[PDB]
Amino acid sequence: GLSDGEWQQVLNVWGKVEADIAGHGQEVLIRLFTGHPETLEKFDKFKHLKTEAEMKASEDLKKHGTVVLTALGGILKKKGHHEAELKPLAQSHATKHKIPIKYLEFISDAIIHVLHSKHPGDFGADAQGAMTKALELFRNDIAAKYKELGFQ
Numbered sequence: 843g844l845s846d847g848e849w850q851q852v853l854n855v856w857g858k859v860e861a862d863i864a865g866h867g868q869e870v871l872i873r874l875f876t877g878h879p880e881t882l883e884k885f886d887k888f889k890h891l892k893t894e895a896e897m898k899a900s901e902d903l904k905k906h907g908t909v910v911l912t913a914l915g916g917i918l919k920k921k922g923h924h925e926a927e928l929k930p931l932a933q934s935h936a937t938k939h940k941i942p943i944k945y946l947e948f949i950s951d952a953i954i955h956v957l958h959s960k961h962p963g964d965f966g967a968d969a970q971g972a973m974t975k976a977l978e979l980f981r982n983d984i985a986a987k988y989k990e991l992g993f994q
């Protein structure tokens with residue numbers, strides 16, 4: 843649950859992402875894959891990537907980064923009223939991709955890391971607080987659907 847002022851911070855930060863969605867999406871996935879190499883094994887189309895240089899050179903990884911952040915941005919713009927947008931993603935990630943909630947924690951922290959890396963000194967403590975709360979809400983509502991499905 844976020845206040846109006848917190849949502850305003852989230853959507854202000856998101857403007858930074860929308861200026862370069864592919865570059866942000868690429869770096870988020872690279873941070874996930876290099877920090878948590880077990881996550882790469884869930885992607886049949888990226889498991890061939892052995893080095894970060896190959897990851898950086900992969901145009902399909904940048905494409906998928908655009909898909910991921912476009913979906914997340916659509917959810918964030920609903921300011922919590924995201925049941926219709928979130929349900930299909932919860933279902934596909936639990937039942938088809940088999941993504942444990944832990945990996946959603948990993949990618950949430952990766953987003954925070956990338957924002958500081960690309961905007962050092964321009965991602966203030968209030969903005970980090972609000973973005974963190976928004977990603978916690980996203981993860982918590984996914985977790986509720988995971989529990990319904992019995993997925994661990």
Ligand code: HEM
Nearest residue numbers: 881884885886887909910913914931934939941945946949
């Ligand atoms: C912010 C969190 C995430 C968002 C918004 C997101 C979004 C998406 C979307 C929109 C798709 C394509 C449609 C679909 O299959 O539902 C997708 C596919 C997929 N996601 Fe995610 N995802 C997220 C996190 C993760 C994480 C953490 C993992 C694994 C560590 C993951 C694994 C996958 C896989 C394996 C696919 C299929 C890729 C393919 O072969 O095309 N997702 N995701």
